[PDB]
């Protein structure tokens, strides 16, 4: 898609564009990709329904000279219905390369389940020494360092994922863990 | 069953260890930062408590250390020198003689 270059009517298709999210906790491409297929095939339906109502030199006005039954044919024909198979499949193959990267982003995914306050109030529960406190820091700066290690941005197809808008989710859980240990720390530095 | 620990030297009956052993993890626990003054206090405050632990010679003595070596008068009956494997302290109870 970015290859090719479009008119007017069709300014919203060109090197398509969509936002990536969490849709419930899940890494999702916010509008649907079969929605965005079928807005290519949208995109396609006002081709073809142009393109099957023309005006050729047989059709000439409203088809009176001759009908546009070769249109139809041709709608029926290869180019068009099977074609939609290949269409349908690199699309479905697409959505496998993004649950690729989705298998191997669910350890990273990790950090919603750590954010409940009662896994930080477990180990809270040890009274662990300050060593223990920044291993905990070093252990959410590593993840840090993946959440920045989101270069996988290939175009999913005729694709694009907002990367960013991912990045950006991860960082703001990591900082919740900071912020809970700030409380109790700050509380023994105010005291001392 | 007890919390994990090693006997380096025990001589009393073993359920004044039992009790001995119980409170002194929750303590350790209770009392994750500080000094180790707070837990001879706390602990000697506790185990001078029960009507158990009834004779005694001279009183209480309780101390905490990581590196060290004593020589002790100890009353014959009560003496107990111990671990606790999380923290590694090694922790030393007894009656004056």
């Keep these: 898609k970015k290859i090719p270059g479009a008119n007017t009517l069709q300014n919203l298709k060109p090197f398509f564009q969509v936002e990536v999210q969490l849709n419930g906790d899940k890494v999702t491409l916010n509008p649907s990709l079969q929605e965005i297929q079928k807005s290519i095939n949208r995109a396609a339906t006002a081709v073809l329904r142009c393109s099957k109502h023309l005006y050729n030199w047989d059709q000439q006005n409203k088809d009176s000279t001759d009908k546009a039954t070769f249109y139809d044919m041709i709608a029926c024909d290869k180019e068009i219905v099977k074609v939609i198979l290949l269409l349908t499949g690199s699309i479905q193959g697409t959505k496998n390369k993004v649950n690729e990267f989705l298998s191997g982003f669910t350890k990273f995914e990790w950090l919603c389940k750590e954010s409940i306050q009662e896994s930080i109030k477990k180990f809270s529960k040890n009274g662990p020494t300050l060593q223990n406190y920044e291993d905990q820091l070093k252990k959410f700066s590593q993840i840090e360092e993946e959440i920045e290690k989101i270069v996988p941005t290939y175009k999913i197809g005729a694709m694009e994922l907002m990367t960013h808008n991912i990045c950006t989710s991860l960082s703001t859980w990591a900082k919740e863990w900071k912020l809970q240990y700030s409380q109790d720390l700050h509380k023994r530095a105010r005291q001392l | ?97």
């Design chain 2, 1 to 97: 069953p007890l919390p994990p620990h090693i006997i380096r030297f025990n001589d009393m009956a073993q359920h004044l260890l039992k009790k001995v052993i119980r409170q002194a993890d929750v303590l350790i626990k209770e009392n994750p930062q500080g000094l180790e003054k707070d837990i001879a206090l706390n602990l000697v405050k506790f185990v001078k408590s029960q009507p158990e632990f009834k004779i005694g010679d001279g009183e209480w003595q309780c101390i905490i250390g990581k590196n060290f070596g004593c020589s002790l008068t100890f009353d014959a009956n009560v003496l107990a020198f111990f671990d606790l494997l999380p923290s590694r302290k090694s922790i030393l109870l007894f009656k004056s003689g």
